[PDB]
Protein backbone atom coordinates (compact mmCIF):
# COMPACT_ATOMS: atom_id res chain seq x y z
CA UNK A 1 0.00 0.00 0.00
CA UNK A 2 1.12 3.52 -1.01
CA UNK A 3 4.33 2.03 -2.49
CA UNK A 4 3.54 2.75 -6.15
CA UNK A 5 3.58 6.43 -5.14
CA UNK A 6 7.35 6.02 -4.67
CA UNK A 7 8.46 4.59 -8.01
CA UNK A 8 6.16 6.89 -10.02
CA UNK A 9 8.12 9.70 -8.39
CA UNK A 10 11.35 8.02 -9.57
CA UNK A 11 9.98 7.83 -13.12
CA UNK A 12 8.63 11.40 -13.00
CA UNK A 13 12.06 12.64 -11.98
CA UNK A 14 13.70 10.81 -14.90
CA UNK A 15 11.28 12.11 -17.53
CA UNK A 16 11.81 15.64 -16.20
CA UNK A 17 15.55 15.22 -16.67
CA UNK A 18 14.93 14.30 -20.31
CA UNK A 19 12.54 17.24 -20.73
CA UNK A 20 15.05 19.76 -19.35
CA UNK A 21 17.65 18.44 -21.81
CA UNK A 22 15.38 18.99 -24.84
CA UNK A 23 14.00 22.43 -23.97
CA UNK A 24 16.23 24.29 -26.50
CA UNK A 25 14.61 22.36 -29.36
CA UNK A 26 10.99 22.36 -28.17
CA UNK A 27 10.63 25.83 -26.67
CA UNK A 28 11.15 29.45 -27.57
CA UNK A 29 10.58 30.45 -23.93
CA UNK A 30 10.69 28.61 -20.59
CA UNK A 31 10.55 30.40 -17.22
CA UNK A 32 9.99 28.49 -13.96
CA UNK A 33 9.12 30.13 -10.61
CA UNK A 34 8.38 28.46 -7.24
CA UNK A 35 5.60 30.16 -5.31
CA UNK A 36 5.62 30.22 -1.50
CA UNK A 37 2.33 28.28 -1.61
CA UNK A 38 0.68 26.48 -4.54
CA UNK A 39 -1.91 28.31 -6.57
CA UNK A 40 -5.15 26.57 -7.55
CA UNK A 41 -5.84 29.28 -10.12
CA UNK A 42 -4.18 31.25 -12.89
CA UNK A 43 -5.33 33.86 -15.41
CA UNK A 44 -3.40 36.51 -17.33
CA UNK A 45 -4.69 40.03 -16.94
CA UNK A 46 -5.45 41.63 -20.31
CA UNK A 47 -3.12 44.61 -20.14
CA UNK A 48 0.57 44.95 -20.86
CA UNK A 49 3.05 47.73 -20.09
CA UNK A 50 5.75 48.30 -22.74
CA UNK A 51 8.34 50.52 -21.02
CA UNK A 52 10.27 53.01 -23.12
CA UNK A 53 13.00 51.54 -25.31
CA UNK A 54 13.50 48.28 -23.42
CA UNK A 55 13.52 44.80 -24.94
CA UNK A 56 10.68 43.30 -22.84
CA UNK A 57 7.15 44.04 -21.70
CA UNK A 58 5.42 43.55 -18.32
CA UNK A 59 2.41 41.23 -18.10
CA UNK A 60 0.36 40.37 -15.03
CA UNK A 61 -1.31 37.29 -13.60
CA UNK A 62 -4.07 36.66 -11.10
CA UNK A 63 -2.97 33.86 -8.72
CA UNK A 64 -4.03 32.65 -5.31
CA UNK A 65 -2.77 30.61 -2.37
CA UNK A 66 -3.66 27.24 -1.03
CA UNK A 67 -2.08 27.03 2.41
CA UNK A 68 -2.27 24.56 5.25
CA UNK A 69 -3.43 26.58 8.29
CA UNK A 70 -1.77 29.84 7.22
CA UNK A 71 -3.30 33.09 6.04
CA UNK A 72 -4.30 32.83 2.36
CA UNK A 73 -4.08 35.63 -0.23
CA UNK A 74 -5.39 36.66 -3.60
CA UNK A 75 -2.24 37.46 -5.59
CA UNK A 76 -1.34 39.69 -8.57
CA UNK A 77 2.07 38.86 -10.02
CA UNK A 78 4.02 40.60 -12.78
CA UNK A 79 6.01 38.81 -15.50
CA UNK A 80 8.57 40.38 -17.84
CA UNK A 81 8.31 38.83 -21.34
CA UNK A 82 10.62 39.54 -24.30
CA UNK A 83 9.13 41.40 -27.27
CA UNK A 84 11.60 38.37 -13.95
CA UNK A 85 8.55 37.27 -11.91
CA UNK A 86 7.51 39.31 -8.88
CA UNK A 87 4.49 39.39 -6.60
CA UNK A 88 2.96 42.85 -6.84
CA UNK A 89 -0.17 42.70 -4.62
CA UNK A 90 -1.46 40.30 -1.92
CA UNK A 91 -5.01 40.71 -0.61
CA UNK A 92 -6.21 38.84 2.51
CA UNK A 93 -8.54 35.97 1.51
CA UNK A 94 -10.65 33.63 3.72
CA UNK A 95 -9.39 30.15 2.98
CA UNK A 96 -7.68 29.02 -0.16
CA UNK A 97 -8.47 30.64 -3.51
CA UNK A 98 -10.37 27.89 -5.39
CA UNK A 99 -10.52 30.04 -8.54
CA UNK A 100 -10.14 33.73 -9.38
CA UNK A 101 -11.38 35.39 -12.61
CA UNK A 102 -11.20 39.06 -13.63
CA UNK A 103 -14.20 40.87 -15.04
CA UNK A 104 -13.79 41.44 -18.84
CA UNK A 105 -15.40 44.88 -18.75
CA UNK A 106 -13.24 46.00 -15.81
CA UNK A 107 -10.22 43.82 -15.07
CA UNK A 108 -9.61 45.57 -11.72
CA UNK A 109 -12.61 43.55 -10.52
CA UNK A 110 -11.74 39.98 -9.52
CA UNK A 111 -14.20 37.29 -8.39
CA UNK A 112 -13.03 34.40 -6.17
CA UNK A 113 -14.38 31.09 -4.86
CA UNK A 114 -13.82 30.36 -1.14
CA UNK A 115 -14.09 27.03 0.78
CA UNK A 116 -16.83 28.58 2.95
CA UNK A 117 -19.03 28.69 -0.21
CA UNK A 118 -18.96 32.53 -0.38
CA UNK A 119 -18.12 34.04 -3.74
CA UNK A 120 -16.01 37.15 -3.12
CA UNK A 121 -15.43 40.23 -5.31
CA UNK A 122 -12.36 42.41 -4.99
CA UNK A 123 -11.49 45.65 -6.77
CA UNK A 124 -7.76 45.17 -6.32
CA UNK A 125 -7.00 48.87 -6.73
CA UNK A 126 -9.04 49.51 -3.57
CA UNK A 127 -6.56 47.53 -1.43
CA UNK A 128 -2.99 48.28 -0.35
CA UNK A 129 -0.39 46.20 -2.11
CA UNK A 130 0.80 44.80 1.29
CA UNK A 131 -2.03 42.93 3.06
CA UNK A 132 -3.69 43.97 6.30
CA UNK A 133 -1.48 42.41 9.01
CA UNK A 134 -4.66 41.41 10.89
CA UNK A 135 -5.32 38.87 8.17
CA UNK A 136 -8.94 39.97 8.10
CA UNK A 137 -10.60 39.63 4.70
CA UNK A 138 -12.41 42.76 3.48
CA UNK A 139 -13.98 41.95 0.10
CA UNK A 140 -15.78 44.61 -1.85
CA UNK A 141 -18.80 42.32 -2.30
CA UNK A 142 -19.84 39.01 -0.76
CA UNK A 143 -22.10 36.98 -3.01
CA UNK A 144 -24.34 34.50 -1.22
CA UNK A 145 -26.35 31.66 -2.65
CA UNK A 146 -24.29 28.50 -2.43
CA UNK A 147 -24.40 25.99 0.39
CA UNK A 148 -21.02 24.44 -0.48
CA UNK A 149 -17.77 25.46 -2.12
CA UNK A 150 -17.15 25.11 -5.83
CA UNK A 151 -14.89 25.98 -8.73
CA UNK A 152 -16.56 27.22 -11.94
CA UNK A 153 -16.79 30.99 -12.23
CA UNK A 154 -17.73 32.97 -15.35
CA UNK A 155 -18.36 36.67 -16.04
CA UNK A 156 -20.76 37.49 -18.88
CA UNK A 157 -18.64 39.40 -21.49
CA UNK A 158 -21.79 40.97 -22.96
CA UNK A 159 -23.78 41.84 -19.81
CA UNK A 160 -21.55 43.66 -17.36
CA UNK A 161 -21.65 42.39 -13.81
CA UNK A 162 -23.61 39.17 -14.56
CA UNK A 163 -21.58 36.44 -12.83
CA UNK A 164 -22.14 32.67 -12.87
CA UNK A 165 -20.81 30.25 -10.28
CA UNK A 166 -20.87 26.40 -10.05
CA UNK A 167 -20.79 24.57 -6.73
CA UNK A 168 -20.49 21.18 -5.14
CA UNK A 169 -23.99 21.88 -3.79
CA UNK A 170 -25.23 20.80 -7.27
CA UNK A 171 -26.37 24.34 -8.18
CA UNK A 172 -25.37 27.21 -10.39
CA UNK A 173 -25.83 30.71 -9.00
CA UNK A 174 -26.27 33.90 -11.01
CA UNK A 175 -25.59 37.37 -9.57
CA UNK A 176 -26.09 40.72 -11.24
CA UNK A 177 -23.77 43.11 -9.37
CA UNK A 178 -23.87 45.86 -11.96
CA UNK A 179 -25.83 48.37 -9.81
CA UNK A 180 -24.58 47.24 -6.38
CA UNK A 181 -22.10 49.65 -4.76
CA UNK A 182 -18.84 47.84 -4.02
CA UNK A 183 -18.69 48.77 -0.30
CA UNK A 184 -18.77 45.35 1.36
CA UNK A 185 -22.44 44.69 0.58
CA UNK A 186 -23.79 41.15 0.63
CA UNK A 187 -25.70 40.20 -2.52
CA UNK A 188 -27.88 37.09 -2.76
CA UNK A 189 -28.29 35.28 -6.03
CA UNK A 190 -30.69 36.55 -8.69
CA UNK A 191 -31.31 33.07 -10.02
CA UNK A 192 -30.26 29.59 -9.02
CA UNK A 193 -30.27 26.85 -11.67
CA UNK A 194 -30.90 23.30 -10.37
CA UNK A 195 -30.85 21.01 -13.42
CA UNK A 196 -27.77 19.03 -12.36
CA UNK A 197 -28.09 16.13 -9.86
CA UNK A 198 -24.43 16.08 -8.73
CA UNK A 199 -21.46 18.42 -8.11
CA UNK A 200 -21.33 21.15 -10.83
CA UNK A 201 -17.68 21.42 -11.80
CA UNK A 202 -17.62 24.31 -14.26
CA UNK A 203 -19.80 26.95 -15.86
CA UNK A 204 -19.17 29.34 -18.73
CA UNK A 205 -21.03 32.01 -20.63
CA UNK A 206 -21.19 31.93 -24.41
CA UNK A 207 -18.92 34.58 -25.86
CA UNK A 208 -21.51 36.03 -28.24
CA UNK A 209 -25.06 35.26 -27.12
CA UNK A 210 -25.71 37.14 -23.87
CA UNK A 211 -28.41 34.73 -22.62
CA UNK A 212 -26.59 31.41 -23.19
CA UNK A 213 -24.26 29.50 -20.88
CA UNK A 214 -23.12 25.92 -20.42
CA UNK A 215 -22.46 23.87 -17.28
CA UNK A 216 -20.81 20.49 -16.74
CA UNK A 217 -21.00 18.26 -13.71
CA UNK A 218 -20.24 14.96 -12.04
CA UNK A 219 -23.52 13.61 -13.46
CA UNK A 220 -21.58 13.33 -16.77
CA UNK A 221 -23.78 15.93 -18.47
CA UNK A 222 -23.15 19.08 -20.46
CA UNK A 223 -26.16 21.36 -20.10
CA UNK A 224 -26.90 24.42 -22.25
CA UNK A 225 -28.97 27.07 -20.46
CA UNK A 226 -30.96 30.12 -21.64
CA UNK A 227 -31.48 32.83 -19.03
CA UNK A 228 -34.61 33.93 -20.92
CA UNK A 229 -36.34 30.70 -19.92
CA UNK A 230 -38.65 30.80 -16.89
CA UNK A 231 -37.82 27.18 -15.94
CA UNK A 232 -34.57 27.09 -13.92
CA UNK A 233 -34.67 23.39 -13.09
CA UNK A 234 -34.43 22.13 -16.73
CA UNK A 235 -31.84 23.37 -19.27
CA UNK A 236 -32.43 24.05 -22.94
CA UNK A 237 -30.26 21.06 -23.93
CA UNK A 238 -28.74 18.23 -21.89
CA UNK A 239 -26.13 15.80 -23.28
CA UNK A 240 -24.45 12.75 -21.85
CA UNK A 241 -21.02 14.08 -22.61
CA UNK A 242 -18.57 11.62 -21.06
CA UNK A 243 -18.31 8.26 -19.34
CA UNK A 244 -17.23 9.96 -16.06
CA UNK A 245 -17.26 13.34 -14.32
CA UNK A 246 -17.03 16.37 -16.59
CA UNK A 247 -14.67 18.91 -14.99
CA UNK A 248 -14.45 21.78 -17.45
CA UNK A 249 -15.84 23.43 -20.57
CA UNK A 250 -14.71 26.19 -22.89
CA UNK A 251 -16.50 27.97 -25.79
CA UNK A 252 -14.48 28.61 -28.89
CA UNK A 253 -13.91 32.41 -29.12
CA UNK A 254 -13.84 32.32 -32.96
CA UNK A 255 -16.44 29.63 -33.81
CA UNK A 256 -19.78 30.48 -32.24
CA UNK A 257 -21.18 26.92 -32.47
CA UNK A 258 -18.16 25.02 -31.10
CA UNK A 259 -17.15 24.16 -27.52
CA UNK A 260 -14.98 21.58 -25.74
CA UNK A 261 -15.30 19.62 -22.49
CA UNK A 262 -12.72 17.74 -20.41
CA UNK A 263 -13.42 14.75 -18.24
CA UNK A 264 -12.36 12.20 -15.68
CA UNK A 265 -12.67 9.73 -18.58
CA UNK A 266 -9.33 11.19 -19.81
CA UNK A 267 -10.73 12.72 -23.01
CA UNK A 268 -11.57 16.15 -24.38
CA UNK A 269 -14.85 16.16 -26.30
CA UNK A 270 -15.67 18.55 -29.15
CA UNK A 271 -19.27 19.72 -29.53
CA UNK A 272 -21.47 21.58 -32.02
CA UNK A 273 -24.41 23.39 -30.40
CA UNK A 274 -26.50 22.84 -33.50
CA UNK A 275 -26.47 19.07 -32.97
CA UNK A 276 -25.53 18.04 -29.46
CA UNK A 277 -26.71 14.45 -30.13
CA UNK A 278 -23.39 13.76 -31.92
CA UNK A 279 -20.00 14.35 -30.29
CA UNK A 280 -17.85 15.86 -33.03
CA UNK A 281 -14.49 14.39 -32.00
CA UNK A 282 -12.82 12.88 -28.97
CA UNK A 283 -9.24 13.95 -28.21
CA UNK A 284 -7.45 11.03 -26.55
CA UNK A 285 -3.90 11.11 -25.21
CA UNK A 286 -4.19 12.09 -21.56
CA UNK A 287 -3.39 9.29 -19.10
CA UNK A 288 -5.53 10.63 -16.20
CA UNK A 289 -8.33 13.05 -15.28
CA UNK A 290 -8.56 16.35 -17.19
CA UNK A 291 -9.41 19.42 -15.14
CA UNK A 292 -8.84 22.38 -17.49
CA UNK A 293 -9.53 22.99 -21.19
CA UNK A 294 -8.95 26.31 -22.92
CA UNK A 295 -9.14 27.49 -26.49
CA UNK A 296 -6.30 29.64 -27.87
CA UNK A 297 -7.17 33.35 -27.88
CA UNK A 298 -5.31 33.77 -31.22
CA UNK A 299 -5.97 30.57 -33.27
CA UNK A 300 -9.46 29.15 -33.82
CA UNK A 301 -8.34 25.52 -34.34
CA UNK A 302 -6.06 25.38 -31.25
CA UNK A 303 -7.04 24.28 -27.74
CA UNK A 304 -5.16 22.92 -24.77
CA UNK A 305 -5.98 20.66 -21.84
CA UNK A 306 -4.40 19.66 -18.56
CA UNK A 307 -4.93 17.72 -15.38
CA UNK A 308 -3.73 15.02 -13.03
CA UNK A 309 -1.34 13.25 -15.45
CA UNK A 310 0.99 16.33 -15.09
CA UNK A 311 0.89 17.02 -18.83
CA UNK A 312 -0.48 19.96 -20.74
CA UNK A 313 -1.50 18.88 -24.25
CA UNK A 314 -2.00 21.33 -27.13
CA UNK A 315 -4.38 20.15 -29.90
CA UNK A 316 -4.87 21.37 -33.52
CA UNK A 317 -8.27 20.30 -34.79
CA UNK A 318 -7.34 21.23 -38.36
CA UNK A 319 -5.00 18.21 -38.25
CA UNK A 320 -7.71 15.66 -37.39
CA UNK A 321 -7.50 12.72 -39.76
CA UNK A 322 -4.15 13.50 -41.40
CA UNK A 323 -1.77 10.73 -42.38
CA UNK A 324 1.24 9.92 -40.23
CA UNK A 325 4.28 7.78 -40.69
CA UNK A 326 4.02 4.86 -38.23
CA UNK A 327 7.07 6.36 -36.47
CA UNK A 328 5.08 9.60 -36.18
CA UNK A 329 1.86 7.79 -35.22
CA UNK A 330 3.87 6.54 -32.20
CA UNK A 331 3.69 9.72 -30.15
CA UNK A 332 -0.04 10.05 -30.76
CA UNK A 333 -2.77 11.34 -33.05
CA UNK A 334 -2.08 13.89 -35.77
CA UNK A 335 -4.22 16.46 -33.97
CA UNK A 336 -1.83 16.36 -30.97
CA UNK A 337 0.40 19.36 -31.67
CA UNK A 338 2.51 19.50 -28.52
CA UNK A 339 2.88 17.90 -25.09
CA UNK A 340 4.27 20.14 -22.36
CA UNK A 341 6.18 17.95 -19.92
CA UNK A 342 7.71 20.58 -17.66
CA UNK A 343 5.54 19.97 -14.58
CA UNK A 344 6.18 17.23 -12.03
CA UNK A 345 2.85 17.43 -10.17
CA UNK A 346 -0.82 17.71 -11.04
CA UNK A 347 -1.48 20.88 -13.02
CA UNK A 348 -4.07 22.98 -11.27
CA UNK A 349 -4.81 25.60 -13.89
CA UNK A 350 -3.36 27.26 -16.95
CA UNK A 351 -3.95 30.41 -18.99
CA UNK A 352 -3.09 31.44 -22.54
CA UNK A 353 -1.46 34.87 -22.69
CA UNK A 354 -3.94 37.16 -24.53
CA UNK A 355 -1.25 39.50 -25.94
CA UNK A 356 1.68 37.22 -26.82
CA UNK A 357 0.62 34.33 -29.07
CA UNK A 358 1.54 30.80 -27.95
CA UNK A 359 2.69 31.93 -24.46
CA UNK A 360 1.05 29.92 -21.67
CA UNK A 361 1.27 30.12 -17.87
CA UNK A 362 0.60 26.83 -16.02
CA UNK A 363 0.66 26.17 -12.26
CA UNK A 364 0.97 22.88 -10.40
CA UNK A 365 0.49 21.43 -6.88
CA UNK A 366 4.19 21.41 -6.08
CA UNK A 367 4.13 25.26 -6.06
CA UNK A 368 5.61 25.56 -9.56
CA UNK A 369 4.52 28.26 -11.99
CA UNK A 370 5.83 28.00 -15.56
CA UNK A 371 5.60 30.58 -18.32
CA UNK A 372 6.48 28.90 -21.58
CA UNK A 373 6.10 29.03 -25.34
CA UNK A 374 6.64 26.12 -27.68
CA UNK A 375 9.14 26.45 -30.52
CA UNK A 376 7.85 28.39 -33.54
CA UNK A 377 8.76 25.60 -35.99
CA UNK A 378 6.19 23.40 -34.20
CA UNK A 379 3.16 25.50 -35.19
CA UNK A 380 4.79 26.69 -38.48
Amino acid sequence: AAFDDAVEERVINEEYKIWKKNTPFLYDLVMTHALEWPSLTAQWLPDVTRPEGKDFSIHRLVLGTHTSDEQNHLVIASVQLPNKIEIEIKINHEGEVNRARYMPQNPCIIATKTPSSDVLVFDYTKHPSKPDPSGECNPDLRLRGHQKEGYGLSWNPNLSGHLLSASDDHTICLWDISAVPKEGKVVDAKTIFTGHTAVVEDVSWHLLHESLFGSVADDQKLMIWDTRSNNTSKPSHSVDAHTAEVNCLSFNPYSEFILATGSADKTVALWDLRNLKLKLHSFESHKDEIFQVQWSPHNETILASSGTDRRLNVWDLSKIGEEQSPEDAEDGPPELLFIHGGHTAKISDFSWNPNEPWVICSVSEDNIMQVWQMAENIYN
Binding site: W37, P38, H66, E365, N367
Partner: peptide, 10 residues
Protein backbone atom coordinates in the same frame (compact mmCIF):
# COMPACT_ATOMS: atom_id res chain seq x y z
CA UNK B 1 -11.72 15.75 -4.23
CA UNK B 2 -9.93 18.21 -6.51
CA UNK B 3 -7.66 19.88 -3.91
CA UNK B 4 -4.61 18.17 -2.43
CA UNK B 5 -4.73 17.41 1.26
CA UNK B 6 -1.44 19.00 2.38
CA UNK B 7 -0.02 21.85 0.32
CA UNK B 8 3.62 22.60 1.25
CA UNK B 9 5.27 25.97 1.96
CA UNK B 10 8.64 26.81 0.41
Amino acid sequence: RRKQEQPKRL
